[PDB]
């Protein structure tokens, strides 16, 4: 049966897939990975709800070689 799953909202500047994959690869396996180049945002889906909460708490409040990323939760209401 289908499950709601748990997609996380990722925001930041100059963000790439290889970088995000590593920012969510070790946090757990992703069933689907999406990225938004027009809004500079990215979406991360986790098969385990704990993989999203553990990655959102560890990824949230972090910095890169010289950039800052932001993790948020998708709104229940559809855009």
């Amino acid at each position: 049966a289908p499950r709601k799953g748990n997609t996380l909202y990722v925001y930041g500047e100059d963000m790439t897939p290889t970088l995000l994959r590593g920012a969510f690869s070790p946090f757990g396996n992703i069933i689907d990975l999406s990225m938004d180049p027009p809004r500079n945002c990215a979406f991360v889906t986790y098969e385990k709800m704990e993989s999203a909460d553990q990655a959102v708490a560890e990824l949230n409040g972090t910095q890169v070689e010289s950039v800052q990323l932001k993790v948020n939760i998708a709104r229940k209401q559809p855009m």
Side-chain angles (χ1 to χ4, degrees):
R3 298 181 64 161
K4 298 185 186 274
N6 190 358
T7 304
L8 304 179
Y9 184 83
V10 182
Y11 185 88
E13 298 185 351
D14 297 343
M15 294 185 301
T16 34
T18 346
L19 187 69
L20 292 139
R21 184 184 187 198
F24 295 91
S25 156
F27 281 100
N29 302 134
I30 303 163
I31 71 174
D32 186 83
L33 183 133
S34 192
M35 290 193 72
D36 242 291
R39 296 186 304 154
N40 297 344
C41 320
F43 297 92
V44 185
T45 309
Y46 268 133
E47 188 185 0
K48 201 185 173 125
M49 297 190 74
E50 293 192 1
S51 303
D53 190 7
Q54 184 182 354
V56 171
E58 293 298 345
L59 293 189
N60 178 255
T62 63
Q63 197 184 342
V64 227
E65 297 183 351
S66 214
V67 165
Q68 297 182 344
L69 200 134
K70 294 180 189 254
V71 182
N72 293 344
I73 307 312
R75 297 184 304 182
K76 184 183 186 296
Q77 216 148 209
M79 296 187 300

